[model samples]
Target: TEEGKLVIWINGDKGYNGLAEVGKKFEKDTGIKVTVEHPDKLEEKFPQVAATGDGPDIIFWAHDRFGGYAQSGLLAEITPAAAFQDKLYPFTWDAVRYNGKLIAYPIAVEALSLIYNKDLLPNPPKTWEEIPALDKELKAKGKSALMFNLQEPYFTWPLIAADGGYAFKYAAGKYDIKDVGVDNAGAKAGLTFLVDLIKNKHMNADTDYSIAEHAFNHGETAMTINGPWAWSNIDTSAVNYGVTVLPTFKGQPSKPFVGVLSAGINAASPNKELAKEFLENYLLTDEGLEAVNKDKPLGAVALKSYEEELVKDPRVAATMENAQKGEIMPNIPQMSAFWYAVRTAVINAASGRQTVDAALAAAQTNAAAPMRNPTDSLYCCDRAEDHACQNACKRILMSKKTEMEIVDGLIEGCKTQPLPQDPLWQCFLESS
Candidate 1:
């Protein structure tokens, strides 16, 4: 029967390769065909395809997407067996749940930590205040003490949150989007520290991900703030690195954002029961997870029973240790607005274009505004049938423009190749 088979979609070769082995074993034991697919643009395509009942039976993705999918009724509620629930860490459940319902199975967890070149630094600093002296020492040796992607919100959050800063308040199993704290005194202190470092030449102001990562790999930098995902390249480069939790700021530990990778059953799947069984029996078991981890270690295993084995590796141990002091990344759709606003704030402050207080204040205001619907904006571009117009529209939307600016920009974009038959152009003409 067609229902005897299950299809799973995941991005990247590591995911496909690992799950493909599990799928093979699953088919042998259960007499059910398990098809694992490596799909490009799985995040963007999953919702569009699933809405029409044509998506995969299971979708593997980051847990941050759970809120949107569950709210949209695209995911089936999962009821893990009590025994299975007991095998995993408590926070792992929090990552995959929405409105008190388990919508996915948490597979692995990851968080940021201080990864240092042991040969260069020997010992990592325990506090932010200690970095300046280390920077002076490393400078004489033609090396910088620390570097990270200053413009990225994900990389900057640990510093911002070291004291008491937070993007939104999470309480009683809900995220209070109304209570944004990015502009609070604690957050101001964090950004001020970074600005001062750049001004004193203790850190580079122009460092982006590429620049920072390249410098670290070449031993030009002694330490970097990054997550487990950065290990593959560093290992290949033979940098003799060591990982540990980030340094403290003002007596408070740096709290990096924790992210979980998870698998969810599509609500429209014909093989829902079978898919659930495959996940619980084949993918979630000790043997199953080990097989997947052998191919590529699943960052920090969510299964407490399996963690002891994975944590033997120093990298995994450090990541898990850091995650213990971290906050789960918010899994709400409103987080999109938060990311844009914070990135803008960090860029402005780091570049000296705005004072730390002024930049964060503007970010708070931007985050509080209603996020624009890119789908609605892009719909008009789709009708234009011009690649240049579509690109312009995308650029405008991503720039965090006001409603008037977006309308004007969209009009200007379409003007390059106006189509009178297009509804967007006709509407603009009528309004003008």
Candidate 2:
């Protein structure tokens, strides 16, 4: 009776329909009484649930967002039997692996690819080098060359990866943040290429992914770089279609971020062993693989288990093939700053606020330094429950802790810190 039937909590873009289907099948077969809940406010709800020591048996989340949570010791390690591990793909397993232990149960994987209309862009530009005076030409001809997201970080990847610039380098079994390679020569060129597209007005920074999706699927837009999640929403049959990796500028290819849906058990779950068993028995099965893959329209981490069976459906095969080329999104917590940093630089350059070089350097410095060789103590203390520690971190970072003026958490209009100090100066002696 120790490993009692388990309850599971999940929150994600993967719809509740699939969850409903799976829950029914899983509980019926395993005799495990299970409960599944969908979240209206996933981010806010998950933390609250986890803190209560009454969290779900398993959780599903995007790869990057889970890093910081793990750092705070919220996620649970879920690597079960080696036989179970053998059912999943190596790279897929890598997506959930942190420090050699699989912390999350593998679910679904996706990667960005150039999904284009064979009619308009029959032969898509092989490189950014072939991307010519697209905007003005499109205006005169009444045809746009590409579709992009203005507020989101989805399609801006080619510019960064094509230049062979990576946010953080992984080598010798760990991430090297000091490498800060995104500002490298090749990446800068990649970013310049992106900015030029925006400056020319080819990319509608005013429009979001949904607008671009309509344009592309409706045959108004030329081409778009999007993940598999878009497949369910878009109509692909009207136009002839082709799929390929995003073009590269330097020697390296434009690598897409591997979109992985992973499940980590709750450290607070009461039926830990039963939770693990349910996860392994149901989630790792061929039934589970097709269940998620069919509903999500993304690639399978189930590996060769379904390779032959899935190939019967060509669409499934193509999606899985595309995932083969994507890069595993590193789960290192320090990589957090890189997300905001990349968005800042790419968006600024795209919006014409700063040159590619300037924006990239600024982003690189802010994201990489504070995270890798962190000097700013107050950065993570924004939620500091301790008032003195929070203020101390702020003071050390401002080099004017003595100058802070927070009265009951409200600033009383006193300022000791220099307004225009070097960002690193915002760090305390030891933290810096």
Candidate 3:
């Protein structure tokens, strides 16, 4: 009965169509029939569907999302069964692992790089100090040198990491979320550097992904700091571009965060073993990766034996060169909060709404709140029969107790603080 009923859910064209191509062989190689579908809002939908015992056996997505999913027990720990772990690049493991468990199989890697118009700057700046002179030269010729999504921390993290900043520090071989470095002096130094660029008119707070992409596509700017995803948007007729590592800052290295696109098995799936076989045997194979690379050349998959072959493409080579200097993204649940915190700091400093120190300080403040679930309804308080019962429900729901404690307290407290005024004597005060 389990022979030909495998299904996978992915979020976009890269995964859906690419996997579709690979699935043909998989279905042919074995009797297993494979089906791939792109579910709308897969991030929001898959988590719910999987929890209810009805979702795909596999999920194709970015590894950064693994943390919250892993925390919620929505993923299968396939590391012990993954015989090909050693075949992948070591950095790939950083994203696929959470709580010392391998939750996903990394298939591709991406990191920020400086895409420069070859016509304008034949020799791109190799250091932070070289940018000013380049900017001055570009401006005189009615061109701009540096431009990127000003508020996006994904592109901005490299600068922040230059001096000494980080999302979380590894302690005793694990990421200690409590040791956040977003607002550290190094991050401030990075933000300050950006603000100076805004003040000098070389860049602006309004320069976002769209604007920068448009400018770069039309040859308005000589260079843009962006990831490989932006490559397809380029207008080849208007500009010829080359990719390389983004410049360093004041003798410090610019180390961007590397993100891995990976395949995961839903913990609730009935076809867990089949999914593992698909990842470990099919997807990691030379044929599967080649099909994926052909469809989406930006993948930069982590297989050492295959990477040299993949990097033969100039763009992939550039991506690999830059990613080698980058750090893998922290795959912890707290990292979900770090993105917002880091973005706020970058935007505030860029917009001049707050000083670099103040901006970075705000980022470091309340950096862990988003990881807490806020959408849970206070079901105990709803549809109460009387005011006394309702009031008691409100008090219990408002407490900072854990979800387990919150519900437990509702059951326990309602008995002790009885509301005699109501037929259902729940927690309440007797005195007016």
Candidate 4:
């Protein structure tokens, strides 16, 4: 410990062994001690690490992970990183920066894209309008259109956004919690577009991605909007698959969530400078880049590190094409509330537990509550009740034409009645 061995924490999930080797090589290159502790989830370790005020030199985490750490004051403040920050997405840096301090170095960038069965689709739908007719044609040929879980809010937002709907509005240093883009007119049009497809038997909104992949593998559907991480779930046994970027709705494409996998230094580490050095070596060294890119081959989060090779990695290319249109996902601490609330609204709407408006309104109501006055207050103030609030709550009330909502200005999401025992029908179900 006195000689200053570099310590790093990693998630034990898939794609970690490569990082382990990187650690070994890093130690070999430098006489410093190197340690990596892989855990299930960083959230569990955050409190203790912050509480003890003693933590490992570096940790691998995501943008969402930064939100919790930001709130807990567990991450270091690298306001003046000795190394120049380059090649990273704007949102990726923003996610790790806390209280105006740069806290983490990014390692990977992720985005969602559309993947289809190559045999069935040569020219994928370039616009949302074409999807319905395409779905109908496929279904008439005795193939299901698609199988997707309509119960998740995260999954629905991109579809809703394609038609110009956003769940929340964070613009001009202001936050508005009242925004439920899912119920907007554009949102309605977007949802209706897909709903009509399902109704017309052009597409089947199944509850499971597996069913969708199975359908695609079995030549049931042409496309599904998803992320690169889902490749393992794809059924590629009999069919060649093709991946395309998300298409535009009214000339604007899906500005999806940009997920970041990054390396962060511990706030209270005794070897703070040494930790920074290790991070520098890990992130800057070719070995470090390869370490992070090993198993899954995450594209360079830093722009300088990004190259044509990244675009050529077909899976990365498909995902990256969509990344260009993606919005850097926010790492705000209260963001989870938004995700949970949205999913709640979506699941309830899909299951008929509540009307789309009811669920959207309720989700928006909860999500906006914290953001009402985030800059001035930890919790979002009531827009009407607290006029003195300094933080921006402008986006909360900003309405959109959500496609998930059925009627114009109404909160009705798409409804479906799949045939009983349809493989898709079973996939829509969570427990049942």
Candidate 5:
């Protein structure tokens, strides 16, 4: 029990055998006991556990969630020494910093790129000039040159950013939320490129995660713009795939959005110094890195010194190259509102239902829309002076069950404006 002093939360769904091995090594290295949890939807559960002072010492997750947690005083600032700074790439180091304070230890860097079947294409396109030749050749054989999940903004942001699009500008030591750039000229150029790809029969927006991966694995498609997460889906025995950075777009490097898989100290963690030591010394060891890459290799190690060994896999090599050219994903709380609007806009434009300009405008409006809080809607029913509303509230509270005809009484309270399945009702149910 004395040795098991630290607990690290891992996404067991993502596969944990590798991380579990690293945990054992970490425990042995420091004489500190280590426990790991693969919580289903752990991110949703994090705040509740953290608030109750029952959270893990270290949380392994994507950097995007850090901004919200850090801003809410839920994460500890990681104080790394000068010696440790030289270990990782500059971009990864920068990824962990929120509001100019380092709050996470960046460990794995990932960026999407063109992963193509080497047997089908022989030579992968390296530049814009090279793309058309491959495109023409693939189509001639009744096969496709490229494909991706067009409806997903994470995959589409690279195209939008090629010319200059961005979500927000980081200036004056903060992300300027008002400076959303998803509808800007660069983003338009990117979106246009995507629509063109679909319109020209290169690929269509209808391609889904399963369809995209299936086509490539079966040789129905020559290439796909995908991230490391999709690697496990590939049937390598059937498809000889190789990874390469996205081609230059209109003479500019295609800037994929890069995310860092990092570890952050919980603000409530009691063993702050020991956690720091384990992350800095034990977890960064070659053994730890090996465990990380054993099953499904993580994109690229954040540590520059390990690149020579880890980059042997083409996927890692391409990801590293892209990480250098890619944009670090914005880890601001405002990003929560940005994805849905942009994803919908991408779908609309790709579907030919709207022009790029119209789609972008609609996206901006959607992103700016302010939905009312569900809690307020539920409270409104109880706070109303009307006899029916007050009586319904008493009846609703008296019932211990959410199901049955009792729920109908609560909905009836809003006789003038019924609260159906709105957030207010949903929140009340969860709370009860």
Candidate 6:
């Protein structure tokens, strides 16, 4: 006798309805009840629940979480059938793998691209050198030529990566967490280009996601760098826009980070085989993908056949083209350090608080700092009973170690006593 129930947890409504639609068909065909739950803060909650050998059989989330989950023994390694493997883009497979073992099934791919107002700039500039002239022309008309969230590393990665810059070194199917490249000559050059744009008044130093979105949506700007996730909002706006690969830098093509939205089977799930069956036979098929796409058109489908055949929208086509040119976002837990470091670098340089070289050099230093094992803190925090200890743990958890100094401060604050047996002390000692 089998439990006949398969539960899936997802973060939001992006693909929930479509999964529900497919669930109905799956239940009808296989006699298995498929329940897809939309849980608030699924990313944070899933790990906690899974740690207890409980929670949903499947999880729908981005590939970036694969490394942490897999390393923590919360995700099952999946050996996708050859037929299933042959149907999807090779890059999608790469996104779901951790240490050369597949841990998830990719559903969609996304990458940053140049979004331009068709009415204002029908022909998007192919190189950064052309932006100054366009900026001057647009300024005369009281409009800006380009705008994006200058403070966000994700939004600025294309510029940083245009000249061989990367967050980490990947070779032999693994990321070298120690080898951060943000302060290299290539990365410095990229940041210098952005600084020049700000100095020349071609791009604003204060622009953020909301500001850029407002300007572009209202037709105050000719172009912005964004991903497919922004398309729905852009569609609602009156701006007539088109998408293309990001403009080149010094004749070298800009390379944005590619992110994949994927689904993985939980290691603790009793219905693991059933969940795998559903993904392989039902959810990953053309009928299932089309249903999801109908509800919320994927930025770029991972399945090559579906993307090439049914995806007719030019915007999605452009995004897919750009995704092909980009590198997969590193899925290692060390990516937290990278994100923190890069954000600081961009903000310091953009705000004139630090020179481009200084900002990037500082980023490199912070990112390469020795990190305490996250699991040690998590274990002690979970078992902590006192309010002070719990509060200290919460601070550590919430920070995600963005700043080592902050983490060290939190640790210092938690040491209210010298008791070596205290859970907090144990955590600090183990981690240290």
- Per-residue lDDT value at 257 in model 4: 69
> Candidate 4, 293: how far from true, in Å?
3.1
RMSD values for the candidates in order, in angstroms, are: 10.1, 9.3, 8.6, 16.1, 10.5, 8.0
RMSD of 6: 8.0
Expressed as tens digits, the lDDT of each residue in 1-432 for candidate 4 is: 233776777765435666667767767777666776776656567556555545666777667667556554456666434345654546567667766777787667777677777777778887767776776677677764455556555555666677676755787864455554556666655555555555566654456656665666566677776654455445335767777777677777866666777777765566777766666656555556655565545643454555445666777777777777766666766666777877776666555567656766676677766443212222222222233321122122122223222122111111123334333223323211
Q: How much does candidate 2 score in TM-score?
A: 0.75
Candidate 5 runs further than 4 Å off: 1-15, 27-57, 89-91, 126-142, 170-174, 199-201, 229-235, 270-274, 312-314, 351-355, 365-432
- What's the C-alpha lDDT at position 23 in model 2? 71
Query: How many clashes would you count in candidate 2?
Result: 3
Candidate 1's C-alpha runs over 4 A off are 1-16, 27-56, 171-173, 205-210, 352-354, 370-432
Winner of 4 and 6 under lDDT: 6
Model 3: per-residue Cα lDDT at residue 96: 90
- Candidate 5 lowest-lDDT run of ten: 371-380
What is candidate 4's TM-score against the reference?
0.70
Question: Mind giving the per-residue lDDT tens digits that candidate 1 earns over 1-432?
Answer: 147899999866244676888999999988899888878879768878875568999998778877777755668899888988988888889889877789999988978899999999888999998998899999999888999998778898988998888988888977788889999989999989999999989997789878888999999999998876577668779699999989999989998888898999987688889988998888888888877766655789788877878789988988978888878888886776787899999999999999999999999888777644433343344445677876565556445467788778887776754457767666444542
Q: How would you encode candidate 6's per-residue C-alpha lDDT over 1-432 as one tens digit per residue?
A: 125688888766366787888999999998999988989879778888775556789998878877787766677888788888999989789889887789999988877889999999999999987998999999999999999998679888888888878888988967788899999988999899888999999997999988998899999999999876577678889989999878998788888888898998886677878988899888888899877766666678888877887558888888877877778887887776788899999999988999998999999988888775554354455456567766566556544465475457555756565547676666656663
Model 5, residue 16: distance off in Å is 2.9
Local error of candidate 6 at residue 373 (angstroms): 4.5
Residue pairs in clash, model 2: 105-263, 395-401, 397-426
TM-scores, each model vs. reference: 0.76, 0.75, 0.77, 0.70, 0.73, 0.76
Clashes of each: 0, 3, 0, 37, 3, 0
Error of 3 at 86 (Å): 3.9
For model 3, give the 10-residue run with minimal summed lDDT: 423-432
Instruction: Arrange candidates by lDDT, descending.
Output: 1, 6, 5, 3, 2, 4
**CA lDDT, every model vs. true structure:** 0.82, 0.64, 0.74, 0.59, 0.75, 0.81
Error of 3 at 229 (Å): 3.5
- lDDT, candidate 6, equals 0.81
Evaluated with TM-score, which candidate comes out highest?
A: 3
